[PDB]
Write a protein that binds this ligand. Structure first.
Ligand SMILES: CCCCCCCCCCCCCCCCCC(=O)OC[C@H](COP(=O)([O-])OCC(O)COP(=O)([O-])OC[C@@H](COC(=O)CCCCCCCCCCCCCCCCC)OC(=O)CCCCCCCCCCCCCCCCC)OC(=O)CCCCCCCCCCCCCCCCC
Ligand SMILES: CCCCCCCCCCCCCCCCCC(=O)OC[C@H](COP(=O)([O-])OCC[N+](C)(C)C)OC(=O)CCCCCCCCCCCCCCCCC
Ligand SMILES: CCCCCCCCCCCCCCCCCC(=O)OC[C@H](COP(=O)([O-])OCC[N+](C)(C)C)OC(=O)CCCCCCCCCCCCCCCCC
Ligand SMILES: CCCCCCCCCCCCCCCCCC(=O)OC[C@H](COP(=O)(O)OCCN)OC(=O)CCCCCCCCCCCCCCCCC
Ligand SMILES: CCCCCCCCCCCCCCCCCC(=O)OC[C@H](COP(=O)(O)OCCN)OC(=O)CCCCCCCCCCCCCCCCC
Ligand SMILES: CCCCCCCCCCCCCCCCCC(=O)OC[C@H](COP(=O)(O)OCCN)OC(=O)CCCCCCCCCCCCCCCCC
Ligand SMILES: CCCCCCCCCCCCO[C@@H]1O[C@H](CO)[C@@H](O[C@H]2O[C@H](CO)[C@@H](O)[C@H](O)[C@H]2O)[C@H](O)[C@H]1O
Ligand SMILES: CCCCCCCCCCCCO[C@@H]1O[C@H](CO)[C@@H](O[C@H]2O[C@H](CO)[C@@H](O)[C@H](O)[C@H]2O)[C@H](O)[C@H]1O
Ligand SMILES: CCCCCCCCCCCCO[C@@H]1O[C@H](CO)[C@@H](O[C@H]2O[C@H](CO)[C@@H](O)[C@H](O)[C@H]2O)[C@H](O)[C@H]1O
Ligand SMILES: CCCCCCCCCCCCO[C@@H]1O[C@H](CO)[C@@H](O[C@H]2O[C@H](CO)[C@@H](O)[C@H](O)[C@H]2O)[C@H](O)[C@H]1O
Ligand code: SF4
Lengths: 98, 114, 96, 97, 83, 51, 70, 155, 174, 115, 318
């Protein structure tokens, strides 16, 4: 494939590894989810624009709409985690081991 | 998978209509009226064949009719036409609406002399 | 007032669009020759550059079909100075 | 679709955007329109098992149009040979290049 | 009507901004169906030629298709000039 | 099956509700004055703020 | 008095006039005395590219009229 | 001639600095009321380029307008240290000058010059708004006489 | 060099991703995401998507501003971590940069590269379309068709956004 | 190329002014001068301590509403369609649902800041 | 020649910004029964020059607790993006003619907010942080209404190109058919530029100096220039949107003179407003936009989608 696809596919993989390798802040990982959506938007937009798939031009817009619903949902849960524990640390969410 | 058959450079040779877009736009409405037949025959060819190499001869007749069309303007209405496409050329958008006076002079010239 | 003005702007757009429709055959005829001529020149220089290459067959398609296929930018401007390649690829996007 | 209510009800919910050779606004064609049309018509009705072998030529052409992988492989070779010859001094480009 | 009319005069006193909003949104929803000029919007949009008009092969039996653009046959925009 | 790794596990609450942490969402403490346009230059208004 | 605020307004007005005046004049200078060609859509850029080829001097603002048709 | 060039550059930086003195919005007691009257229309300090700014980072002058107590002294020194340089201090009124009516009190600093260096002392209890303005214009003339670049040239 | 503009932007695109994927303080992660949003907008613009490019930049700028507010409230510590302050963060940062540097160095050396999957490296311009002169923006025509072709898309997205408001209210009402 | 040049010049000009600002003046750096500002008294606690957001729900609602404008911005182009019956209905449907969503959050006290 | 065109854009901008500072001080002064600057140069004409020189030979401070890189970056962003906002403005010809010029200006305005957030956060001080979070609240308040207000106006113009607004208003100012939107646009620009009665991110009487409280000297000047540059630019945007000037292609300077007068008067109204009103509370600003403008803006966005269609007056796409 063309060389741009190398860097966009690399960007998605970097964000995916970022998502799968948590640190402490839950917000750091929610950022990696938004990054994953950014790389999909760019990769989808390039393919659609290059091929002149006219009707598909709206598809990246729809992707962003549900990226925001995902982001808003992630922040709402972060608020409730923050209220319960005083931090958004993910190691506090271990009650359900038992 | 096979070699692509390209016409030789000496089959692509036609006399070119070397005028600027402002010149083409000024004459476009009369050009579309006068050169309809060869022009609509080339476009029916291109859409039917879906191949530029299958329509070269038709495309050459488009060029010839265009040169003949501009020769007629040159012989009769050269000066009213130059004023008109000079006015169109000034506009960054090449707007018809800014040059209705020069267009009127050109239109009545070609209406009388042709 | 805006209704009347926007109606006149729609009548002016139609006239502008129709002048383009008048000229499209001439522009289409020219574009065909320029593309075919540019492809011929690429094939002349492919012949010499790849003359010594063992398996090369100059001008060979990558498609099984013999139908005409519109060339991509790399094929049309494959062996041309970057300045004209830059103009043909990014000229329109970068114009103001 | 798992349940084909679209076919039964005769309502087009999403199959208008499934292929690039379907009707587009103002009849703008996709770059690979003809290749997609050729592959789609070859494979129509015969099923994927047959289409995977009996329409391989059409699919390969369509795939080449989509990603142009073989075209860049060819242009890469010509560009590599040219840069080799130039430095060796064997080749001079024509005035129009 | 009294209950609704009394409700109207109440929201004018308390929330005139929301009264205007609902009034404006209502006219947006309703007037396009009552307008006599709505039909021309589609006609104008349809008459704008973004695409080349590819000619038809004269098979010898399409009497309602013009041979020349200045021939009588075909759609006309006289309605648009008088608009 | 008890194991050394699960020795510290306790059955969950009967009604699924764990007690609330006594964690302190501490308030921000701000020196509002003395050198402040609204403190009249000599008021050290020590304020505890939540937002 | 209030009219003593005008000198600063006049200086401010002159400065805000220059960018528009300069851009308009620089455009005419760089396009042979005409407005800079506006290319919002591919069609307009195609015509401008053809003008550059047709000019003979690689300038899309050098127009060729009937004098160039034989 | 370097002497001539540095002399003219001194005039420019001096002129720019005295023409744009931004006092810190900082006042302590009754003297601060007369400072308000200097900003009021009759005297319009702003017409001299003198503009109050609340942040010490954006101030050139500290006008100590009122009594400095022992409890307030560390805060006054703090906000003076936080002024970037060059910075100037105008002592306004008897209290700031040397303690004034409260000189013998257990809780009062006997003059703000025990805490910060002072460029101008404005006498009065309070100095009139005009007296304070006279002090500001006296500060301007002190800045006009500065020889920073001429002394650097001869170092 | 300008012919490789899309490739250069895509390199910065990845660098921004390494920025926030190494997960420093979310203040700096947000900055990394904003840079990638801008260059990502630059990349999509160079393929003819002016509206898509600007829209994704506009959306992520609003998003990261809300993330900034939530960071100062719910994801802060006394010593927020830059990339150099934490060994795990620094190691991820350098690892990502080195992998990117190597893929770039080799793909620009051979005009091609094989990093798992074969990528051509002739410049992204070779694949572009050659023949267009329409009086409209094709991307604009496709996007506008949302309201005439995409009735079904409008309904499901419209409903999802309304339910989203309902849902966040429920989730955050303890 | 013109756009890139214009951006480079703007930020180059701003960067140069900052370089002059830091290398032209005479500095006198010491501890008390650069300490954080809190009206003359030392701060109590770090400024990095959590700062509660009382409009947190409006902020999340902003993300959803901010995306609606991305759906609505193409409306001038959609008005150029021949299929105006569908486009107008769908255009009004989207705005109405946004208005309903605002009304819900309003009536359910979602726009009021936490106390 | 284009590089010269750029310099003939930003140097005048900086000069106009410098003398706007004088004009505001004089205009405010006379509304307050005083004079404002009238000593430093005749009628105070040199006052801006003294202030600029003063600030740039003043010692800049990097606070001990501050994040060094972000602290320096933010003022560069503020001024660099303030200048960027001017390049697509048709006066009557833009320096950069854009297809989506309005969308470019929205995006560049959103990016500029981060020069407030990062300066405030990088300072690492309480008044700076409070100021920054007020900017978060301010952007949430006006951004959605601002975009939808523009949309409604652009449904009469037909495109996102700023030069098309000149064509749209050839016969009549858009303020006539859209004065309700012009009113709500005008208030939004006051909130967008952090101007009174929405000067909350600074909020002097409350936060000393808010987000820029730790900034001194040259770095402080950059924030000041950026703000006053945005005040003029936002009022040029308003003049183009609603008070469109007629453009004679052969006498483009007549457009510039007329358009400059309108831009100046609109800028004066900003100074006028600052002299007249008290300040909003920053929660009350959010409720103003969301509970008043947004309901009205949604309704008027519906009306301006339908009005072209029902009157058969849809603008041309091109
Ligand atoms: C135009 C650029 C404007 C910004 C100018 C920055 C330099 C300012 C000079 C300065 O920092 O003061 C001296 C300062 C030294 O003073 P210091 O107080 O002793 O040390 C300061 C801290 O140690 C270190 O300072 P710090 O606390 O700010 O942390 C350093 C750095 C942390 O840097 C790192 O940890 C690794 C580098 C990360 C940047 C690389 C990209 C990260 C991912 C985003 C992708 C963007 C690519 C570009 O922080 C950053 O994240 C830099 C953000 C830059 C954003 C640029 C926008 C793009 O810097 C040095 O001289 C070194
Ligand atoms: C960048 C260059 C900017 C040039 C600024 C020119 C300063 C003009 C000026 O000094 O005002 C007249 C000033 C006015 O004098 P003044 O400031 O002492 O007046 C005191 C106030 N009045 C008059 C009302 C009582 O003339 C000078 O004092 C000479 C200063 C020379 C400045 C250095 C120039 C080199
Ligand atoms: C909107 C843009 C506006 C920008 C305006 C820019 C300012 C224009 C006016 C310039 C006037 C000349 C500057 C003089 C101010 C110097 C500060 C000062 O007063 O220090 C006193 C000092 C006095 O030092 P000193 O040796 O006497 O003693 C100080 C040390 N202690 C405290 C121990 C006593 O002057 C100097 O040290 C040098 C004076 C040099 C004068 C020539 C200036 C050259 C500047 C180049 C510096 C090199 C770094 C590059 C910076 C960027 C270059 C542009
Ligand atoms: C092969 C190897 C070759 C290596 C070459 C490099 C060798 C480096 C030599 C080191 C020389 C030591 C210099 C020390 C120094 O520069 O600090 C002093 C000075 C700051 O000023 P200061 O002296 O502290 O007092 C006056 C303040 N107004 O200056 C500063 O510290 C300020 C520096 C600012 C940052 C610029 C970098
Ligand atoms: C966190 C630190 C933040 C630091 C801030 C630094 C400044 C960032 C500045 C914003 C970055 C995004 C810039 C995006 C520009 C978009 C402007 C635009 O849309 O028009 C540009 C133009 C497209 O032309 P258009 O009119 O839309 O249609 C073609 C007809 N000519 O097309 C062009 O002019 C060519 C543009 C290609 C190069 C764009 C590079 C942008 C990549 C980000 C830098
Ligand atoms: C009550 C106070 C409210 C506070 C809010 C602030 C409102 C201030 C608004 C300032 C704008 C006022 C209007 C500007 C008048 C400037 C007149 C001028 O210089 O130009 C003349 C102009 C007619 O020319 P023209 O605009 O080209 O015609 C329109 C066709 N496009 O116009 C003819 O007169
Ligand atoms: C011009 C014709 C179109 C007009 C459409 C007007 C619709 C207005 C919708 C309500 C907007 C007002 O917002 C709020 O509404 C509630 C009811 O919901 C009103 O309160 C009302 O509640 C109930 C009815 O529901 C009544 O018993 C009560 O007496 C009345 O005050 C408030 O006065 C007002 O604060
Ligand atoms: C802050 C971190 C920033 C990271 C940015 C990362 C950038 C990635 C590297 C991009 C460099 C690409 O480098 C690009 O390669 C091609 C190779 O043909 C060169 O293109 C070349 O074309 C022909 C080849 O015969 C030569 O005559 C010409 O001299 C040369 O320009 C470009 O001149 C060069 O600019
Ligand atoms: C919570 C869910 C809320 C759902 C709200 C849905 C609101 C829908 C309100 C009706 C809006 C459309 O109303 C309808 O508009 C179309 C134009 O677009 C009009 O259509 C008319 O003009 C068009 C051209 O513009 C012609 O093609 C058509 O033949 C003609 O009938 C209809 O006469 C009118 O009835
Ligand atoms: C399609 C676009 C045009 C339509 C407009 C769409 C937005 C409609 C918003 C409707 C809001 C109705 O519901 C709203 O709920 C609250 C209850 O908390 C009511 O009442 C409350 O709010 C108002 C104002 O904040 C207060 O004066 C009142 O004291 C309080 O009780 C509002 O008066 C009412 O307006
Ligand atoms: S000097 Fe006089 S007026 Fe000033 S603070 Fe002291 S007692 Fe009050």
């Amino acid at each position: 494939m063309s060389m741009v696809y190398m860097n966009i596919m690399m960007a998605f993989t970097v964000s995916l590894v970022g998502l799968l390798m948590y640190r402490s802040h839950l917000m750091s990982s929610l950022l990696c989810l938004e990054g994953m959506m950014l790389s999909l938007f760019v990769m989808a937009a390039l393919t659609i624009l290059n091929s002149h798939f006219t009707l598909a031009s709206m598809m990246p817009i729809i992707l962003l709409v549900f990226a925001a619903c995902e982001a808003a949902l992630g922040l709402s849960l972060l608020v409730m985690v923050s209220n319960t524990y005083g931090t958004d640390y993910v190691q506090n969410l271990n009650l359900l081991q038992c | 998978p096979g070699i692509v058959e390209l016409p030789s450079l000496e089959d692509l040779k036609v006399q070119e209509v070397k005028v600027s877009s402002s010149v083409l736009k000024a004459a476009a409405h009369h050009y579309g009226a006068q050169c309809d037949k060869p022009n609509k025959e080339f476009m029916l060819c291109r859409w039917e064949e879906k191949d530029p190499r299958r329509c070269l001869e038709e495309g050459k007749l488009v060029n010839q009719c265009a040169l003949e069309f501009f020769r007629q303007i040159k012989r009769h209405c050269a000066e009213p036409f130059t004023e008109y496409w000079t006015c169109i050329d000034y506009s960054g958008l090449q707007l018809f609406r800014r040059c209705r006076k020069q267009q009127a002079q050109f239109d009545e010239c070609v209406l009388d002399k042709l | 007032s805006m209704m009347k003005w926007n109606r006149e702007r729609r009548r002016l757009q139609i006239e502008d669009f129709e002048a383009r429709i008048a000229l499209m055959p001439l522009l289409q005829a020219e574009k065909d020759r320029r593309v075919l001529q540019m492809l011929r020149e690429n094939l002349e220089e492919e012949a010499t550059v790849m003359k010594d290459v063992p398996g090369w067959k100059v001008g060979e398609s990558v498609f099984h079909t013999t139908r005409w296929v519109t060339p991509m930018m790399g094929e049309l401007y494959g062996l041309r100075a970057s300045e004209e390649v830059l103009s043909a690829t990014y000229g329109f996007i970068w114009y103001t | 679709p798992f349940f084909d209510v679209q076919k039964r009800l005769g309502v087009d919910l999403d199959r208008w955007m499934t292929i690039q050779s379907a009707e587009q606004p103002h009849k703008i064609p996709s770059r690979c329109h003809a290749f997609e049309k050729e592959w789609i018509e070859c494979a129509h009705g015969i099923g994927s098992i047959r289409a995977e072998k009996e329409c391989k030529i059409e699919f390969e052409d369509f795939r080449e149009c989509l990603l142009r992988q073989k075209t860049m492989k060819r242009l890469h070779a010509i560009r590599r040979q040219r840069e080799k010859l130039i430095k060796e001094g064997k080749y001079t480009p024509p005035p129009h290049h | 009507a009294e209950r609704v009319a009394a409700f109207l005069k109440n929201v004018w006193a308390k929330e005139p901004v929301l009264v205007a909003s609902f009034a404006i949104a209502g006219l947006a929803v309703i007037l396009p169906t009552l307008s006599p000029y709505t039909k021309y919007s589609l006609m104008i949009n349809r008459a704008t030629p973004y695409n080349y008009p590819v000619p038809l092969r004269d098979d010898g039996n399409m009497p309602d298709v013009p041979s020349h653009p200045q021939d009588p046959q075909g759609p006309s925009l006289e309605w648009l000039k008088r608009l | 099956y008890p194991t050394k790794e699960t020795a510290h596990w306790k059955p969950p609450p009967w009604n699924d509700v764990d007690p609330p942490k006594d964690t302190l969402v501490s308030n921000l403490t701000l020196n509002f004055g003395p050198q402040h346009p609204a403190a009249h230059g000599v008021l050290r208004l020590v304020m505890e703020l939540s937002g | 008095m209030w009219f003593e605020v005008l000198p600063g307004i006049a200086v401010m007005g002159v400065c805000l006039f220059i960018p528009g005046m300069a851009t308009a004049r620089i455009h005419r200078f760089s396009n042979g005395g005409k407005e800079k060609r506006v290319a919002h859509y591919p069609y307009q850029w195609y015509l401008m590219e053809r003008d550059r080829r047709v000019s003979g001097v690689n300038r899309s603002y050098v127009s060729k009229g009937l004098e160039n048709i034989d | 001639r370097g002497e001539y060039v540095v002399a003219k550059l001194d005039d420019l930086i001096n002129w720019a600095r005295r023409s744009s003195l931004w006092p810190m919005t900082f006042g302590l007691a009754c003297c601060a009321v007369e400072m308000m009257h200097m900003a009021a229309p009759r005297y319009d300090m702003d017409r001299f380029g003198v503009v109050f700014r609340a942040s010490p980072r954006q101030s050139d002058v500290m006008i100590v307008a009122g009594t400095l107590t022992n409890k307030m002294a560390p805060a006054l020194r703090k906000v003076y240290d936080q002024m970037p340089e060059p910075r100037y201090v105008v002592s306004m009124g008897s209290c700031a000058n040397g303690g004034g009516y409260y000189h013998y009190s257990y809780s009062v600093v006997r003059g703000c010059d025990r805490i910060v260096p002072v460029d101008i002392y404005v006498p009065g209890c309070p100095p009139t708004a005009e007296a304070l303005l006279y002090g500001i214009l006296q500060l301007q003339k002190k800045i006009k006489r500065e020889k920073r670049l001429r002394i650097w040239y001869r170092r | 060099m300008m012919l490789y503009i899309v490739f250069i932007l895509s390199v910065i695109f990845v660098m921004g991703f390494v920025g926030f994927s190494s997960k420093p303080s979310p203040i700096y992660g947000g900055l990394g995401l904003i840079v990638s949003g801008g260059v990502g907008c630059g990349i999509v613009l160079n393929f003819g998507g002016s509206f898509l490019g600007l829209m994704v930049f506009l959306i992520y700028l609003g998003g990261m501003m809300v993330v900034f507010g939530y960071t100062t409230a719910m994801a802060t510590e006394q010593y927020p971590e830059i990339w150099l302050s934490n060994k795990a963060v620094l190691g991820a940062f350098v690892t990502g940069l080195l992998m990117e540097f190597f893929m770039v160095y080799y793909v620009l050396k051979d005009k091609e590269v094989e990093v798992v999957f074969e990528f051509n490296g002739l410049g992204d311009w070779v694949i572009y379309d050659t023949g267009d002169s329409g009086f409209f923006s094709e991307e604009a025509m496709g996007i506008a068709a949302l309201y005439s072709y995409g009735t079904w898309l409008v309904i499901v997205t419209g409903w999802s956004l309304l339910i989203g408001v309902v849902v966040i209210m429920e989730i955050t009402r303890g | 190329m013109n756009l890139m040049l214009a951006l480079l010049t703007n930020f180059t000009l701003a960067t140069l002014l900052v370089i002059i600002a830091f290398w032209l003046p005479q500095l006198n750096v010491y501890s008390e001068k650069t300490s954080p500002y809190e009206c003359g008294f030392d701060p109590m606690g770090s400024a990095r301590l959590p700062f509660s957001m009382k409009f947190f729900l409006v902020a999340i609602t902003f993300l959803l509403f901010d995306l609606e404008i991305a759906l609505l911005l193409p409306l001038p182009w959609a008005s150029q369609t021949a299929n105006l019956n569908t486009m107008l209905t769908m255009a009004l449907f989207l705005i109405i649902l946004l208005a309903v969503s605002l009304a819900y959050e309003w009536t359910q006290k979602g726009l009021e800041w936490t106390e | 020649m284009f590089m010269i065109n750029i310099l003939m854009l930003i140097i005048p901008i900086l000069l106009a910004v410098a003398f706007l500072t004088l004009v505001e001080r004089k205009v405010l002064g006379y509304m307050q029964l005083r004079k404002g600057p009238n000593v430093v140069g005749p009628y105070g004409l040199l006052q801006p020059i003294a202030d600029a020189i003063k600030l740039f030979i003043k010692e800049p401070l990097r606070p001990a607790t501050s994040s060094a890189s972000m602290f320096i970056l933010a003022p560069i962003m503020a001024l660099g993006l303030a200048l960027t906002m001017w390049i697509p403005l048709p006066m009557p010809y833009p320096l950069i003619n854009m297809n989506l010029g309005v969308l470019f200006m929205l995006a560049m305005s959103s990016l500029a907010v981060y020069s407030i957030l990062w300066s405030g956060w990088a300072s690492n001080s309480k008044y700076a942080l409070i100021g920054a979070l007020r900017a978060v609240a301010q952007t949430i308040s006006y951004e959605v209404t601002l975009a939808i207000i523009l949309l409604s106006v652009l449904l009469m113009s037909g495109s996102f190109t700023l030069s098309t607004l000149i064509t749209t208003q050839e016969q009549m100012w858009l303020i006539l058919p859209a004065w309700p939107l012009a009113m709500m646009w005008f208030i939004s620009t006051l909130a967008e530029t952090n101007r009174a009665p929405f000067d909350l991110t600074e909020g002097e009487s409350e936060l000393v100096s808010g987000f820029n409280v730790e900034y001194a000297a040259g770095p402080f000047a950059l924030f000041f220039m950026a703000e006053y540059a945005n005040i003029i630019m936002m009022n040029i945007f308003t003049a183009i949107l609603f008070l469109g000037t007629s453009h004679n292609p052969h006498m483009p300077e007549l457009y510039t003179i007329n358009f400059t007068i309108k831009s100046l008067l609109l800028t004066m109204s900003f100074l006028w407003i600052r002299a007249s009103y008290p300040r909003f509370r920053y929660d009350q600003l959010m409720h103003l936009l969301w509970k008043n403008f947004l309901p009205l803006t949604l309704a008027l966005c519906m009306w301006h989608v339908s009005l072209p269609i029902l009157t058969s007056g849809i603008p041309p796409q091109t």
